[PDB]
Structure formats: C-alpha cells, structure tokens
Amino acid sequence: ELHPPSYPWSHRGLLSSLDHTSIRRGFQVYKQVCSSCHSMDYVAYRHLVGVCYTEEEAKALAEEVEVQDGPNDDGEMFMRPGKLSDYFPKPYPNPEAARAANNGALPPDLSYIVRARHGGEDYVFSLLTGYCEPPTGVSLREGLYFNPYFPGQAIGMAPPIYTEVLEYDDGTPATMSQVAKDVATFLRWASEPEHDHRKRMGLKMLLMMGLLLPLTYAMKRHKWSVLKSRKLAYRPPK
Amino acid sequence: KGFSYLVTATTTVGVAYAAKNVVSQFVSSMSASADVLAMSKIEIKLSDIPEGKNM
Amino acid sequence: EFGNLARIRHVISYSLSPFEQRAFPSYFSKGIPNVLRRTRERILRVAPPFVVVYLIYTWGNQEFEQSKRKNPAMYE
Amino acid sequence: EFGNLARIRHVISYSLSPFEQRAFPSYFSKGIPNVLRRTRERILRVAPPFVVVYLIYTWGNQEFEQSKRKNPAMYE
Amino acid sequence: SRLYSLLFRRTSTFALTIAVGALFFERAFDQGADAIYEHIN
Amino acid sequence: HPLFKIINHSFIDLPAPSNISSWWNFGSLLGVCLMVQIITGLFLAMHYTSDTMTAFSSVTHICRDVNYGWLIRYMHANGASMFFICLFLHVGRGLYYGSYTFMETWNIGVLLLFAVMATAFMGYVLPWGQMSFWGATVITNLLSAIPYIGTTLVEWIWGGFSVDKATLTRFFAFHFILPFIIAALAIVHLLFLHETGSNNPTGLNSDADKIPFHPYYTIKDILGILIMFLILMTLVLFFPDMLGDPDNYMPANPLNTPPHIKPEWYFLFAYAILRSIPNKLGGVLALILSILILALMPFLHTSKQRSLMFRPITQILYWILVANLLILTWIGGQPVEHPFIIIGQLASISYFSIILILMPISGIIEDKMLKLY
Amino acid sequence: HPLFKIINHSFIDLPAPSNISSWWNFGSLLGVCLMVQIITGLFLAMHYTSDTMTAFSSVTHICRDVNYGWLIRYMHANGASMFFICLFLHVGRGLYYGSYTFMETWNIGVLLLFAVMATAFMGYVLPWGQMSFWGATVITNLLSAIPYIGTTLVEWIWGGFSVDKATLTRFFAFHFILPFIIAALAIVHLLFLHETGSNNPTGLNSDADKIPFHPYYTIKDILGILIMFLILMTLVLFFPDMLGDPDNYMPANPLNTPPHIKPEWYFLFAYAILRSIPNKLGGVLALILSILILALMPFLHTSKQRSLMFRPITQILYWILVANLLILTWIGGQPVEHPFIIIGQLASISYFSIILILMPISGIIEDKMLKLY
Ligand code: HEC
Ligand code: HEM
Ligand code: HEM
Ligand code: HEM
Ligand code: HEM
C-alpha cells in the first residue's frame, strides 16, 4: 500500500496545540458534506463548547438537528429537538441501512476515524485528495474508485470534496485542500478531545521532573558520597 | 547544612506539588463524569396535573 | 543480619562526612575520562552484534522490496 | 516455640495410644450426666436474661397491635 | 547561614518551611508554567 | 512492633552489596509499576463495563467524559508497556550476572513472568476493539493445538463456540484477580531472596562489603522511580500511541478480520518463534519453551565463576542472544513473506542453540583458559 | 526451607492451648468463608455486568441460564450471611473470654469488621434490585450528615446527583477489590496473634499445657468446616430465600420505593441505634461508636482475671448485653411506631451503659469479693 507522506501539521508539534479555527472549519465540513453517510457517534454537542464554539452557538447547532426517539406517555417514541447533551446525528438507522445507502459498503463511524487508521491524519488527507484515475491494467467496478491510498485502491466512497463544495463561514477560500486539511484537523480533534490538554500536562510534567530529577540525583549523591569517598586500607599486623 | 537541606526542602515542595496534583486528578475522576453533569435539562405540562394531584 | 555477615581482619576503613566533602568532586574532571575508559573496555564485546542486526534489518527491508518489485521480464 | 514455652517440674504425664483405647469410652454413659452437670452450672446465668427478652418481645408485639386497633370512641 | 539556624535546622521548622513553600510554589509554578504554555501555543 | 521488625528486616537494616549498579533498581521499579497498574486499573474499573455491547462505549466514555479519564487509561496502557520493559531488563540482568543460581527465586520469577503475560493478554482483550477480538481468537486458538483435550479447553475458556460476551466477562474477572496473585507471588519472590541476599555485578561473595539499604540505596530507588516516571509520562503525555496499534480504535467486527494481525510488541519474540515452526503444535511448544528455557537456565551453568564480568566469550554470546532477541521482535512485526520467514527460522534456531548449547561449551572453554578445567 | 519454616510455624508446630472450646473454631471458619466468598464471587464476576440497564438481567441470566449459576449465587448470598454469623460469634468469644487484652490483634480485628461491613453493603447494592437501590440511597444519604464535608462527599461516592449507574460501577469495583485487602489484614491479624499465642477459656497462662496444632486442632477445624458447610448448604439448597428479602426480586424503580425497607439482619443492631437517636448526626456517630465501642474495650478491663469463667456477675452482664443486642436486632425490623421506638431508645441506652459503665464497676466489685481490691 501507498504510504502517506508526513505533512507539517501544527498539532504534530510536540508542545504545539491544535489550531481551533481549523477544528471549527472541519466541524462545518462534517456538518454539511460528510455527515449524511458517516457517523460521529462518540462526539456530542457538549464536547464542542470551549473548543470551537460557545455555549449558545453549540446550543443553536444542537437545536438545528433533531432527535427522533425516546418514549412518550403512550410509550410513543417521539422526535424532539436535540440538546447539548445529545450526541451527533447518525447517518443511517442501522448497519444494514448503511450497506443499502452506500452501494453495499459500510461507511465507518468517523468518531475515531483517524486514531483508527494507521496513517491517521496523514492517511485521511492523502486519500481525501488522493483520488486519482486508475491506471491501465486496473479496472474497477461500479461503486468503486481508484484511491491509491485506500487499501486495494477501491473505496466505495465517491470523492466527496469538490473544490468549493461548501462555503466556510469564516470565508477562508473553500479550496478542496483547505477543506481536507480542516476536516483532518477536526477528525483528529474528535479522536482526542484533549490533545491540547495532554500537552499542557506534558509541559508542566517535564518542568516538574526537570527540577526533581537533578535534585534527587544530588541527594543520591550526598547519601552516597560517604561511601564513594571511603578509603580502605589493609594493615596486616605483620 | 543549609545548602544541602534547602535542596531537600526544595525537592519536597516540588514532589508535594506533583503529589497533590496526581492525587487531585484521581479524586476528580471519581467525581461527576461530564455526561452526568449534562442533565440540567427538564420539561413539564401544567395541563397534565389537576388540583389535588402530584406528578 | 549485620554483625554476623562475615569475618574480616585488620582492614581499616576511613571515610568522610557528607557535608564535609564536595558533592561532585571532579565530576566532569575524571567522569569523562572514566566513562570513556569504560566504553573502550566493553565496546568490542557489545557493539558488533548490534551492527550486524542493523545490516540484517536493512538487508531484509531492501530484499523484501526487491522481492515485491515487479519482475520486468515477467508479463512480457 | 516448643522447648522454651514454660518451666514445670516433677509433673509426670501418662497417656495411651489412640488405637489401644476405645473411641467413645462411656460416651452416653457419662456424657449425659456431664452435659447435664454443665447446664445446671450456667443455666442460671444464661437463660434468665433471654427469658426476659422473649417477654419484651411478646409485650412489644401485642402493644403495637393494640395501638393500631381502632379506638371505639373514635368516630363515635 | 541564618536560615539554617532558623527554619532548616529544627525538623519541625523544616517541615513548616517545606509545607508553606509548597503552598505558594503551586501558585507560582502554575502561573509561570501557564505563561509558557500560552506563549508556545 | 512485631510488624516493624519485618520492615527493618526487609527494607532498612537489610545488608545489601555496596557495588550493585543501576540494573538492580529495575525489580523495585517492577513493584512500583505493579502498584501503578493496580491503582490505574482500579480507576478504570469504576467506569468500565464488561459487556460486548457497551465495552467500547465505556472505554470512549472514560476517555471523553470522565475527568482525566484519558490520563488514567493511557497511564494504564503505557504502564503495561513500562512493566514489560522493566521485566525484560530484570530478566536480562538475571541472565547476565549469574543470578539464576538462586534457583527458588528464579523459579518464582518465571512463574511471575507467566502470570504477567497472561494478565497483559487478557487486559489487551478487554477494550473489545477490532484488534483485541482477533488477537484473542488467535491465541485462544493456540490452545486448540493440544493433542487430545485441546478443543474442549479452548471452548471452555471461550465459554462458547467462539469468543463472544462469555469470554469478555470472564476475561475481565481474571484480569482483575491475577495482579493480586502476582503481588503475593512477588512477596514469595522477595522472601526466597532475603534468605540468600542479592547478588553483585562482580559475582563474588560480597559479605565483606555490605551497607544498609534505607539510607543508602533508597535514594537510589527513589531516583530510579523518578526517571521511570519521567519516561512513563513522556510516553503518555507526548506519544500516547507509538506503542499501541491503530486498529484497536475500531470496534470489534467478527465479520471482518484486520488484515495485519500482530500481537503487541513484548509478545513479538514469541510470536516469531510460533510462526517459525511449521507445525502448529511445534510452534506452541517452542513458544512455551521460549519462556520456559529460562527456568531451565540454572541447570546449564557449567562455569566456576558466577557472573559474566570476567567472562568475555560468554559476554559475546550473551550480546548475540540480545541481538537475535531484537531480531525476533522485528520479524514478528514483518508480514509472512520472503525473506522475513527464513530469518525467523534461523533466529529461532540461533536463540535455542545459544541458550542450550553454546553458553555451557563456552563456559567450559573459559574454565580451560584459566587453568581450572 | 524458608517457606516450610513459615508453614511449620503458623499451622503445624504452633503451640496451642489444649483446652480451647469449639468457639475458637469460628475464626478459622471466617477465613474459610472468606475464601468461599472470593471463589463464589469470582464465579459471579464472569457473568455479572455492572450496568444499570443489564445488572438485573445479568443476575437473572446467572440464575436461569448458567449451569448451576443459581447455586453459586445463593451460596454467595448465604455465605455472606454465614460470614456475619461467624463474625458475631468470633467477636462475642473475644468479648467474653477477655481476648481484647491482645490489643493489636483486637484493633486489626475491628478494622477487618469495618471492611467486611462495607464490602457486604456494596455487594448488596450490586444486584440493582428495588431494595438495593433504596438501601444504597438511604445508607449513603446517611453520609450526607456531615455539615461541610458530607454533602459533596456523598455525591462523590454517588459519583453524581443521586445514585445511578455511576455508583453501581464503582461499587462493583470496590466490592471486588476489598476482600483481598481483608485477606491481607487477616494475615496481619494472624501475625499480631502468634507473637502472643491464643487465649484459653480459663483465661490463665496456658504455657504449661500446650499441644501441636496439626493433629489436634486441625481435625477439629476440619470438623467445624464440615458442620458450617452443612448449615450453609442447608440454608441454600433447602431454605435458599430464608435470610434474604422478597422486594430485592423486583427491578430498581427510582419512582417507587419499597414500602417496608430494612437493612439485612446483620446490619440491624446498628440500624436500631441510628433510628433511636433523634439527631441525624447523633445517630451516625452512635452508630459508628456501636462498632467502635469494641475497639475501646481493652481500656475498660479493670479486673485481675482475664476470662469470665470465674466471674459470675460480669457473666450476667454479658448475657444481658447479648440479650439486648438481640432486642436491637428485632427492633430494627419493626417499623416506626409505639412502642418499638422506646425499646429502641432504652435498648441503645442499656447497650452503651453496660459496655461503658456496668462491666468495669462489676469487675471492681468481683475483685472486692475475692479480697483482691
Ligand atoms: C455521501 C457519502 C459520503 C460522504 C459525504 C463521505 N463519505 Fe467517506 N465513505 C463513504 C463510503 C460508502 C465508505 C466506505 C467505502 C469502503 O469501505 O470501501 C466511506 C469510507 C471513508 C474512509 C475509509 C473507511 C472505509 O471503510 O472506507 C475515510 C477515511 C472516509 N470515508 C473519509 C471521509 C471524509 C474525510 C469525508 C468528508 C470530509 C467523507 N468521507 C464523506 C461515503 C461518504
Ligand atoms: C488489579 C489491577 C488491574 C485492574 C483493576 C485492571 C483493570 C483494567 C481495566 C478495567 C482495563 C480496561 C480499560 C482499558 O482499556 O485500559 C484494563 C486494560 C488493560 N490492562 Fe489492566 N488492570 C489491572 C492490572 C494490569 C496489569 C498489572 C497490567 C500489566 C500486566 C495490565 C495491562 C492492561 C492492558 C495492556 C490493558 C489494555 C490497555 C488498552 O486499552 O490499550 N493491567 N485493565
Ligand atoms: C513480576 C515481576 C517481577 C518483579 C516485580 C520482580 C521483583 C524483584 C525484586 C523487587 C527483586 C529484588 C530487587 C532486585 O533484585 O533488583 C528481584 C530480584 C530478583 N528477581 Fe525479580 N521480579 C520479577 C520477575 C522476575 C523474573 C521473571 C525473574 C527471572 C528471570 C526474576 C529473577 C530475579 C532474581 C534472580 C533476583 C535476584 C537478583 C539478584 O540479587 O542477583 N524476577 N525481583
Ligand atoms: C475477617 C474475619 C475474621 C477472621 C477470619 C478471624 C479469624 C481469627 C482466627 C483464625 C483467630 C485465631 C483464633 C482461633 O482460630 O482459635 C482469631 C483470633 C482472634 N480474633 Fe479474629 N477473625 C476475624 C475477625 C475478628 C474481629 C472483627 C475481631 C475483633 C472484634 C477479632 C478478634 C480476634 C482476637 C482478639 C483474637 C485472639 C483470640 C484468641 O485466639 O484467643 N477477630 N481470629
Ligand atoms: C473478591 C471477593 C469478592 C468478589 C469478587 C465478590 C463478587 C460479587 C459479585 C460480582 C456480586 C454480584 C452478583 C450477585 O449479587 O449475585 C456479589 C454480590 C454480593 N457479595 Fe460479593 N464478592 C466478594 C466478596 C464478598 C464478601 C467478602 C462479602 C461479604 C462481606 C460479599 C457479600 C456479597 C453480597 C451480600 C452480595 C449480594 C448478594 C445478593 O445479591 O443477595 N462478597 N459479590
């Protein structure tokens, strides 16, 4: 398999955090283009607050979407407006529905699409823009596309990002790439909602060990100096 | 003595600061999970109840 | 326990108090020479197995690639 | 451990092999008398308290019921 | 030298200085550390 | 106090050799890692559910909704990795310095090693990812190799026709309960050692030069604990997925098997051996021997010197053994195709021939060089 | 052999008093019960799920679909009841024969008693019935007594506003982990005792008459184990639901509350005391003291004779104490209404006055009768 190259991502930085405007733009992409077929089940409107949106913006985003279950006085499941506690919508009611509305193929939940695949951010981007004409000698059936990066180079998913597929509210030109980079940052975001935080803990941790180790070693060397200076002498009475 | 012990005292605070932090985060773990906190939501229908009744 | 561990005789043993002696006497003064002294007594026993591990690892990788590389003569 | 537990003197102690002696010598022969001997020695110091317990128990139960019982004068 | 004779020689005082220092160290460390993290990102 | 005596008999007034290097820290690190694992495991157990419908959901709920739950989970995973790093270095110290002549301590050790490997295997099955399910089926299938009672045993463990909820729940129970047995076996390990005292890198009788432990070596174990915590937290807070597999972040699909199934790194050496032997049973046996060959190690010592400090030919053979152990770790990773296979076959042949044949013959030759034999 | 040295010291060549009655069996029974509980608990853990949607379903699946799963579940429940029976008789033996003068053994004992009560409480919460949920809430809200530290602490254990799944899962983790701590504390309990040896019913120095344990108090412990197994099984296989409660066979409804709620039999004496004190806090404290008064017991011994074999007035006071302990067990069961309340209030007053005041005064009087005081 083609091995996606290394891209200079900001969050790839050791002490670098995720660009949150890019996570907001990538959440828009899902909301508009990739949400209808993939499922971000483990990410809920609550997780976004303090990352990409405020409380009222995420509340409006949740109330745009609608829940359809939960019983009623008649034990009558009813459709209601979703809240900050509701999770992201699902593309299809059940796995079979997925196979049905996707040419037999099952679009995997993107909840952790990146942590899932090996190339991770790199792979996702590689494929998103890696759509390419199958060369001579290879022929793909309907519902298949030659994406060098995709295993087998035959991904059922049709190319979902056409330049200017959606308009970024921020206005940043919606070029296919600018969109693939944003959705790769976002998908990364969901897979690790604490990328930034973990990194803040790693900073302070480094500093703390940075002060404790030298000192502890010193002590290790105070309490071991005694012996390390011990001079032995053999004095047979002779 | 003050040089050697100051190092012992310095180190202690550092460890003490880390130890409170580690122990603190665990106590926070046993605390409300984010999801559990997201329950401030609620709804009722006045028509549902007539005088002299609880629901 | 201590006191019944062993029997030695006439072995005098001098020592100094920790606070009375420098913490890192000639640490880099002799430390470097010693560390280097040490490395030269053990490098010939340690290193050449890992050197040939590196050669076998690279070889395997490259050989595997060549193995994967299509046989031009084949299919023609 | 054994050997350093205590100091006794001139206390001879005879015994017999298990297989040489009857397993249950006069088991019910003296067992009954002894068990009876024993009970009469502590019965006066064990039962009396619990007797009163049975009593409080009973009185308590009955009293409660009476409390539940409808007051005749009530409502009349 | 005064410090040793005052807060570092009596073990009780040694503990006192440690505890008090640690109480404030957190404030300083967190503040300083945060400044750095923010500057970085 | 009667209890205090135990402390001053095992940690304060214990006569320890004055010249033991940093390698002797590692076993204490293992004990610390054990506690750390237990503590983190307990804080995973307050939110984990051992149900196949909800296990992946509970793990994601730990990572996303519990306060610092991602921290405790990745500390648990990288602490298992740190446990196996310290375990391998502890075993390598025991092999290099001739510490296997403490035979009871060595045998309790190899029992502890078997228990730790079983605990880590069932723990890796526990998150119920794609990789966990296919990994479990694979090793459970290993048992089927048994000549006559194999099928039954496999089905027993699985608790059904194929691994399914029945397995997950009993694997949760066994993974919970075995580290306490490991702690008890570690107490027996410490006892069987104090009877004889620790060894020194020169391999000589260190009775003339012993020092206390509490004031002297504790600050050394504390420093080693601090360095191990530095490596563990830079593994958790900076590269939390460099040692794990990405395919474990997918849910367990019985209908799809991840094409590339690899057991975790520290099982790789064994994995290589298993794959190397053509016969299934042969593989299983060799695999077992791979670990067991160590137990067999105290009966193969044919030298009049305990340690390898003064034994250069056996030092060369030891580092060749470490070299092809690293080679077997690499091969396991590589897929099934030329020439990875041949290396695997040789590397396994060389591993068993160095441990079984080459080291006692070399020790005989070394005794002949010093005019001892 | 190091191990055999230890083995021979605590179970074979241990010098035991020759005249200890059947009451001295009970502690060994407790250890057996602990293992039995652990074993049965492990076989409940391979099928139990700690999810509020599936906990009752998993318990019914254990009782109905697992082969002999009803046997293991009812063995676990009635073994908890047998554990508390043997625990109460062990504590009564310690109180009657003056064994509390072994102060360290007594304090490790009362720590073990607190741990066993906490383990049984969370275990009874675990099946997630109607009675378990309302019992947990009630017993936990009890913690809500403390003014500044209490409220938050409660929700901390509840892990939320009110007991819900958050609790169940952490209660499963605790209830799993505490019996191993109980086993370690029991090892410390055995150590703090062998330093002093067991007591005899006469209360005298039994150093002149001690016998081995292997052939004399081992077959006796085996016979006691057999009798205890007869009572447990005949309380599982014939009367399986005798000690339980019927309302625990309904699922947990937060909207309804079982009309008649009561703790299990063993926790009642305490329940009575709590209910007796008007003040909530007072109740909690008295409740605690109820258990703690025992720890306080070795400082209240004012007699020159250790045992109660030759002390008839304190024997009468002891049996009055057992009598109103049974009365407090009955009252807890009775509902809140006259005159159950008054009895409860008196019974608690009499309990604390007999333990605190009446027994040392009686011991002084008994010393005066023998021309000792
Ligand atoms: C309207 C349909 C549709 C949209 C929009 C869509 N996908 Fe997909 N996607 C699929 C289908 C169908 C598959 C399964 C293809 C297969 O398995 O061969 C798939 C699979 C994938 C995979 C690999 C997993 C797999 O099983 O193939 C990645 C990565 C992926 N999509 C990324 C994206 C990204 C990034 C977006 C938008 C930013 C997106 N997709 C939008 C239909 C869609
Ligand atoms: C009694 C102590 C322990 C408890 C209670 C415990 C509990 C758990 C739980 C609940 C999980 C599932 C959550 C998770 O995925 O991490 C888990 C996973 C795991 N445990 Fe443990 N554990 C214990 C000890 C250990 C030890 C000693 C090891 C190392 C030998 C270990 C290795 C693992 C591993 C590798 C995983 C999987 C990590 C992953 O998800 O990638 N555990 N443990
Ligand atoms: C469960 C994992 C293990 C733990 C926690 C553990 C722990 C320890 C500890 C704490 C010590 C004493 C400190 C020290 O010697 O550094 C020790 C010594 C020792 N262990 Fe282990 N050990 C483990 C596994 C093993 C294994 C698998 C072996 C065999 C390969 C082994 C062989 C030894 C030997 C020989 C010693 C004595 C070393 C000497 O003094 O020369 N241990 N162990
Ligand atoms: C976990 C439950 C417990 C177990 C398994 C247990 C077991 C034992 C055992 C086996 C003995 C040795 C005596 C014999 O067997 O003949 C013993 C002695 C003793 N236990 Fe317990 N015990 C437990 C709880 C308690 C509690 C709660 C207390 C305090 C109230 C206590 C106080 C004592 C005392 C004072 C002794 C010494 C009495 C003597 O041997 O003469 N134990 N225990
Ligand atoms: C490590 C040891 C132990 C384990 C693993 C364990 C495990 C379990 C599990 C999984 C349950 C829930 C299943 C069920 O209730 O049917 C349970 C219930 C219970 N356990 Fe345990 N347990 C242990 C020790 C104990 C001990 C020491 C006690 C007594 C203090 C105890 C008392 C109970 C009780 C009373 C229940 C509820 C019984 C009922 O449903 O009526 N367990 N145990």
Coordinates of N, CA and C in Angstrom, one line a residue, chain F residues 8 40 45 67 79 136 231 271 273 346 360 373:
Chain F
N8 N 12.2 -3.5 59.1 CA 13.6 -3.4 59.3 C 14.4 -4.6 59.0
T40 N -4.2 2.3 38.7 CA -4.9 2.8 37.5 C -6.0 1.8 37.0
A45 N -11.8 0.5 36.6 CA -12.9 -0.4 36.9 C -14.1 0.2 37.4
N67 N -13.4 12.9 34.1 CA -12.4 13.9 34.4 C -11.0 13.2 34.5
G79 N 1.8 2.0 31.2 CA 2.4 1.3 32.3 C 2.5 -0.2 32.2
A136 N -7.6 -12.2 20.4 CA -8.0 -13.2 21.4 C -8.3 -14.5 20.7
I231 N 10.0 8.8 32.0 CA 9.8 8.1 30.7 C 8.3 7.7 30.5
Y271 N 5.9 -14.5 19.2 CA 5.1 -14.6 18.0 C 6.0 -15.2 16.9
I273 N 8.7 -17.0 17.0 CA 9.0 -18.4 17.2 C 7.8 -19.2 16.7
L346 N 15.9 -19.1 11.3 CA 17.3 -19.1 11.8 C 17.3 -18.4 13.2
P360 N 27.2 -23.2 27.7 CA 27.9 -24.1 28.6 C 29.3 -24.6 28.0
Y373 N 39.8 -26.1 34.5 CA 39.3 -27.3 34.0 C 40.4 -28.4 33.9

